[PDB]
Write a protein that binds this ligand. Sequence first.
Ligand SMILES: Nc1nc2c(ncn2[C@@H]2O[C@H](COP(=O)(O)OP(=O)(O)O)[C@@H](O)[C@H]2O)c(=O)[nH]1
Lengths: 33, 74, 444, 317
Amino acid sequence: DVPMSQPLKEQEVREHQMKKERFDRALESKLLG
Amino acid sequence: QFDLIRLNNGTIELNGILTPKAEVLTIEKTLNIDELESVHNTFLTNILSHKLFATNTSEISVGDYSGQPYPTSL
Amino acid sequence: GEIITLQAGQCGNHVGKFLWSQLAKEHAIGTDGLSQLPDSSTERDDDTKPFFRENSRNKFTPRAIMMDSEPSVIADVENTFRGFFDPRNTWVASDGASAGNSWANGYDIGTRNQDDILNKIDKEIDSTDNFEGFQLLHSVAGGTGSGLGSNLLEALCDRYPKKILTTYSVFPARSSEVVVQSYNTILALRRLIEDSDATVVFDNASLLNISGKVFRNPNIDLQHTNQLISTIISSVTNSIRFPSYMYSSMSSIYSTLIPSPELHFLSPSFTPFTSDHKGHSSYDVMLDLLDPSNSLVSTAMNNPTYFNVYNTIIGNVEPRQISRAMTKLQQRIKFPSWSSSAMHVNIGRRSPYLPLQPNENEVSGMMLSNMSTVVNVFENACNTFDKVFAKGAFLNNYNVGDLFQSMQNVQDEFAESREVVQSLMEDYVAAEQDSYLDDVLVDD
Amino acid sequence: YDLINVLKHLQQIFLGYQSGHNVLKFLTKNMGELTKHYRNDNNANYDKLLQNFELERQSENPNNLMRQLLMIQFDTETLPQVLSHYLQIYPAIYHLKFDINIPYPLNIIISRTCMIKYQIILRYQLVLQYHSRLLDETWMDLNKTPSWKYRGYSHTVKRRIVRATRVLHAKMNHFIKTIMEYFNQNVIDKEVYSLEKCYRNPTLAVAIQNELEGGLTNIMTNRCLSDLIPLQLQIFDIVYKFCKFIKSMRAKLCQLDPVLYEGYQEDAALELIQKLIEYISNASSIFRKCLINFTQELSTEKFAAGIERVLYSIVPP
Ligand SMILES: Nc1nc2c(ncn2[C@@H]2O[C@H](COP(=O)(O)OP(=O)(O)O)[C@@H](O)[C@H]2O)c(=O)[nH]1
C-alpha cells in the first residue's frame, strides 16, 4: 500500500558481491578469458 | 625427485605431468643411445655457441670498435 | 636469529633447568638431546635451531653457557639433561668461592675469568651463524648471581655492541638480608640500567602470592616456581619457536615496547595454564590479563600508567572475542595524553607435539607491559640502601676486587648506583606526566 | 598428491602463512637491496639478488616442490598501480613478484587466477614487512647507538629533537604493526581456517576450487587494498624517509655534543639543529595528516572490528 524500499542486508550483500564479481571479471579478461 | 627444467626467463618447469606418490588408487631416468649422443653434441655445440666462437656467422658481433670477430683479435 | 642462554648463579642455573625442561617438552627433544619424534615424518613444522644446535646427529644442543661458582648446581642440571647439554660451555669459578653474598665477589670472580667466560660464549657463537642475542637468567641480589651478571654484562655490552642481551631478573622478597642484598641489587642494577637490553622483572613475592594458589602447597618454593618464570620465557619465544607470520624477531617485539633509549623493566602477567589451562575464551583471557592478580610483579597499583602494552594469546582464538576485549580495554587503561593507546595483540601456536594439543579448544595467554609502577620492586631495597650504605659495615666490608681498591670507590660507587636507580624511578614518573611531551612536541 | 601439503606450502609462500621466519630471513639478507630498482632505474643488474634467492631456495627440503619451483620476476607496474587498475581505486615503489609453474594436474585447481591473486597478496604483505622491518632496524639504532648518550646539546635538543624523534618513531611503529596485525589476523588467518574447514573431508572438487578463489577474492576486496591504499602509500613514503633520515642525521648530530665529537665549534651544528627541528615538526605534521585522513576515510564507511582496532591505536587519548 506504500512505497517501501528493498531489504537492507540484501542490498548490502549485493553491493559486496557485485564488487567481487566485477573484480574477478576484470581479472578473467586480463587472462584473456 | 623432481625433474625440473630451468628456463632463461626464470621459469622452473616440471618436466611433464606431476605424478602421484607411491600411494595410488590402484623407473630410473636413464639415457638411451641417442640421448647420450645428444648430450654430447649439445655440449660441443654449447662450447661453440659461446659468442666468442661464432666465427662462421653474421650473427657474431664483430667486436665493436675493431670490427672483427673476437678470435681475430685474440 | 640465534639465541644463547646465560645461566648465572644458582638462581640462573635453576631457572634454566625449568626453561630447558619446558623447551624439551615444547620441542619433543629428550633429556638426552634427542628428538623424541619418529623420523617417518621429517618435517617438524617448528624451528629448534635458534635454541638448539641441532646436530647432523639426532642431537639438539641447548645454546647455553652454564655459569656458577658452585659447580653442583650446574651438575644438577647436566645430570638431568644427560646428553642434552654440552659441558664445554660450562664455567665454574674454581679459583676461590665467592667471599660471601656480594655482587662484588661475583664480579671479582667473573672479572678474573672474564676471558675464559667469553671464550665459552664465543665457542657457542661459533655454532650460530645468525647470532642475534642472549638471554640472561639470574638473581638480582646474589653475589655470584648479580656479580656474574654484572661482569657478563660489562664484557658483552662492549664485545658485541650490536647484539641483543636481555635480562631475566629474579627479585627476592625483601627481608633482613637486604642490608647486603640491596646493594647487590642496587650496584648490579646500576650495571643493568646502564648496559642491559630490555629486562623483565620477576618478583619472588608474586611468584609466591601465585604459587600459594597454583602450586602443590607446601611446595610453592621459589626454585619450584621457576616453572612460572619458564612459562613466561617460553611464552615470549613461542613466536620464534613455532613462528607464525607476524612477530618473528626480538627486534620486532621491542619495536612497540621500548619508547626511548631508557632501559625498561617490564612486568609480565599470565593466565590460565597447565604444567606438572582450560580457559573459556580469549575475550576473558585478555580482560583477565589486565589485572594485577595475574602479575608476577607485586606493583599493587590501582591506577598505574601503562605504556607499551602487549599480549599474546595462544590457541583457537576467535578474532571477535579479541576485538570485543580490545574495545573495552581501550576504555580502561591509564596512559599519557601525548600517546594514543595501542595495544598489540599477537596470536601464537601450540606445539604440534604438545601432549595437551589434541584436546585444546580453549585459549590462554601472556601480557607484558611498561608500568610506571614496575619500579616498586626496587622500593624496599632502595629505602634500605639509603639508610644502610650511607655509612654502615655493609658499605665497605663486603667489597672485594676493584670495588674495594679504596673506600672512595665504595662510597661513590654505592652513592652513584643509588642515583642511577633514582634517575630510573624519576623517568618512569616523568613519563606519567603530560609534560613529558608537552614540553617537546610543541617546542618550536 | 597430498594436496593439503601442497597448499600449506603455497600458503607459506604467498600468504606467508606460518612462515614469518622465512620472510624475515630473506628480507633481512636483502633488506637494502630494495632501495633502487623502482627509482626509475632500468635495472638489469639485480642478478645477484636473483642468485641470492636461488641460493636460499637450494637450502629448502627437496620434497617441497612448491619451493623448488618458485621464481623471482620483475614487473613494470608497482603494486599500487596494479591495484588501482584492478579495483577501480580513485587513482610507484617495487616491481618485484614471484610465481610458480604449477604443474598439471594440480594447476587445474590452482588456477592462474589463484596465482595472480597470490602475487598480489604477497607483494602487499612484503611491502608491509619491508616497512615494519625498516622501523625495527630504526628503533635499534635510535635506542642503542650512543646518540642517546648526547647530553651536551641541552634540553633544548634533548626534548624537541630527541624525545620528539623517538615518540614520532614509536607512533609509526605502533601504526604499522597495528595495520599488519589487522591484516594478518582479521583477513589472512580467517581465510586459511576457511580453507581447512571447508576441506576437512570434501565432496566436490569444484567446492575446493571455489573456496580457494573465493577467499583470495575476499582478500582482494578488503578495504585495505581498495580504499586505503593511497594513504598507506603516503605512510610508506614517510616511513622510508624517516628511516633514511635516521642514522645519517643521527651521526651528524654528534658534532654538536663533545661526548662524541671530542675540533667542533661551528654555526653549522646550530644550522643542523634548526634543520632537525623544522624537519621533525614537518615530519610530525605529514604523519599526522595521513593519520587524520586515514581516520576520516575509515569513519565514512556509511554504516568493522578490524577497523576499530586500528583506530584505537591512532586516535589521540
Ligand atoms: N625464583 C627463584 N629464586 C631463587 C632461585 N634460587 C635462588 N633464589 C634466590 O636467589 C637470591 C640470591 O641469589 P642466588 O643465585 O640464589 O645465590 P648465589 O649463587 O650465592 O648468588 C636469594 O635471595 C634466593 O631467594 C630460583 O631458582 N628461583
